[PDB]
């Protein structure tokens, strides 16, 4: 069976009711990315940034938010391929996990985790983060921050991701904008190592022309259709 690397972005979770920033205006929930997703923004107005991620974290866990058929299809793909499948996501939601995928690399972190600003240790966290919330991993308790990678910070799991990029027979980018690096450059890396590259998206990404195979439309229709095609090809 081929080695398959999937990269997902915000597009796949749009139908589930989770929005993201837009290059059209450069706004995430009508906030400038500078203010809610940079280390400077956090330093300038920690109250606002914690409030922002508190709102995102609460909204993620509302009953109307559910994985969609695209998430479910990727779980079936992992079921079929086992160890020869890897899912890397730019998303900070937990919808891949709720769909049944395991060993997901969250390269930009996770909304349902916080991190000790001192030790870097990570905690599961489903509620609000308030100023009174400090770590329990340090002798001198330190403030908690969202375990979310901000612009200007290094993504998580990059060594493992680049290993997979050089190993993949098929690289599939799903729901990515082509505007966020290094993730948007992964297709170039995959191609260099001889991978067959596929884009599945609601609309073409900036780097769409670099993909060998491309399908566009609602993720909940396009992704199950491609996964079915791929699984049938495997006999």
């Amino acid at each position: 069976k081929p080695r398959v690397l999937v990269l997902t972005g915000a597009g796949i979770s749009a139908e589930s009711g989770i929005r993201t920033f837009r290059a059209a205006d450069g706004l995430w929930e009508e906030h400038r990315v500078e203010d809610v997703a940079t280390p400077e923004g956090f330093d300038r107005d920690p109250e606002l940034v914690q409030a922002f991620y508190n709102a995102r974290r609460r909204q993620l866990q509302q009953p109307e938010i559910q994985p969609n058929a695209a998430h479910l299809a990727l779980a079936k793909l992992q079921d079929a391929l086992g160890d020869r499948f890897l899912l890397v996501t730019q998303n900070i939601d937990n919808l891949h996990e709720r769909a049944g995928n395991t060993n997901v690399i969250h390269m930009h972190g996770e909304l349902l985790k916080v991190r000790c600003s001192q030790s870097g240790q990570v905690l599961d966290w489903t509620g609000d983060v308030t100023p009174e919330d400090k770590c329990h991993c340090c002798q001198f308790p330190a403030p908690l921050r969202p375990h979310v990678v901000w612009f200007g910070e290094m993504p998580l799991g990059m060594d493992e991701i680049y290993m997979a990029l050089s190993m993949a027979d098929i690289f599939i980018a799903i729901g990515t904008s082509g505007h966020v690096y290094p993730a948007a450059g992964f297709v170039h890396e995959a191609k260099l190592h001889g991978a067959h590259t596929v884009e599945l998206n609601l609309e073409p990404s900036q780097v769409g022309n670099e993909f060998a195979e491309k399908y566009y439309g609602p993720a909940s229709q396009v992704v199950p259709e491609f996964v079915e095609k791929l699984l049938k090809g495997l006999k």
Partner: peptide, 7 residues
């Protein structure tokens, strides 16, 4: 691959 960055 460098830091998380737009554009």
């Amino acid at each position: 691959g460098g830091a998380k960055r737009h554009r």
